[model samples]
Target: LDLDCGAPGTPEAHVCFDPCQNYTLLDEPFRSTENSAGSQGCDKNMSGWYRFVGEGGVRMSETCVQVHRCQTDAPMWLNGTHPALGDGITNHTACAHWSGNCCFWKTEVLVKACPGGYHVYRLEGTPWCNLRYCTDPS
Candidate 1:
């Protein structure tokens, strides 16, 4: 096992298996965060789910982020604080996709707890956009 990459059985940890394997597909949109305006500068990890439903023939990219062979093509969401060792990072201080309305946007991501520290999101699926953001840098 590598030390640089997080330890086993931890939020910051990852395995060869599907990164989205242990993920829970969300149905209805989960409860919104207490601070509707996320990035209120809060510490610690807050883990939960969010519903990401794309629209029209656009085929938004953030819908399916593939980590390993996990084609996350489902309309599910998983947000976290600390990203893995080599995972991509994103801050939701504002909406990245839709314009304005950061709290409740068209793409709803699951806000999970990444044990490393306070940050933002990990990798997300992007088909129609540029490329797919993954957990492993391979």
Candidate 2:
């Protein structure tokens, strides 16, 4: 039997039914990393821009990188500083994917000093860059 509260939207009307999960709830942080409980990762590499859906690593030599994982442990440029995501969103502005003659793989790091999530990548003719993108981590 179902009891009718006859009311809704007041925290009293919020009820659960049918499926066990509801996607309408955005209040919770969507954890999408290789180790995260949610989506694993998109894991796609090629030319042009790409995303690190899970925000971290899952496999080796894998670009299934994550946004939250775009920080430094020691220091790459800004004195091994850990830059916030907001700063990343304000710098570089674009990047991702290994390039050049495709001989060697370069590294992309995120800094708090700058924004646009700019990946400070450096190389010569064999350009290999992975511009960290934030969105749809999975």
Candidate 3:
């Protein structure tokens, strides 16, 4: 027995099928960093560009497919301070690993600033780790 409604947005709890948790839908704000000081893979220097939205502890899930987990207390940048161009598009600097090589990781996909207090970035459909990519192989 199943009854379908619209969808979710922290309002209603999305029904789960099997081996899944049926919980209320939540969203995260997509914020971009002021610059590209800390945006690079651990082993790859020319991996791509990235931007930090807040201070953390943002883990890459130890993969090369762009998975991030930020600390809950990561602060959000002032509303009109960061470089979010709206409609899921942002402009920010990037770095070459931890070499302090600041550069532009501007855009190849969508980097929209979300509501609530977080940001959303696109993965697949970009260049070969040219302007937006993840870090590490393990």
Which candidate number maximizes lDDT? 3
Which regions of candidate 3 fall more than 4 Å away from where they truly are? 1-88, 91-93, 97-100, 104-109, 124-138
Q: How do all models score by TM-score?
A: 0.21, 0.18, 0.26
Candidate with more favorable, higher lDDT: 2 or 3:
3
4-120 in candidate 2: lDDT tens per residue? 232466765645331112111121223222223323222124222222213432112222333322321110111123334344321221233222222233334222222334222
Q: Any runs in candidate 2 off by more than 4 Å, and if so which?
A: 1-28, 32-35, 43-79, 83-106, 114-138
Give Cα-based local distance difference scores for all models: 0.26, 0.25, 0.27
Model 2, residue 74: distance off in Å is 20
Q: What is the per-residue lDDT of model 3 for residues 1-138, given as tens digits with 9 covering 90 to 100? A: 122232456565455332112222222122122223433322122212233332332212221122221111121111122334244344332222212222212223323444444444323232223233332212
| Highest TM-score model number | 3
Off by over 4 Å in 1: 1-11, 29-138
The lDDT, on a scale of 0 to 1, for candidate 3 is: 0.27
RMSD of 3: 13.7
Better of 1 and 3 by lDDT: 3
In order of lDDT, best first, we have 3, 1, 2
TM-score of 3: 0.26
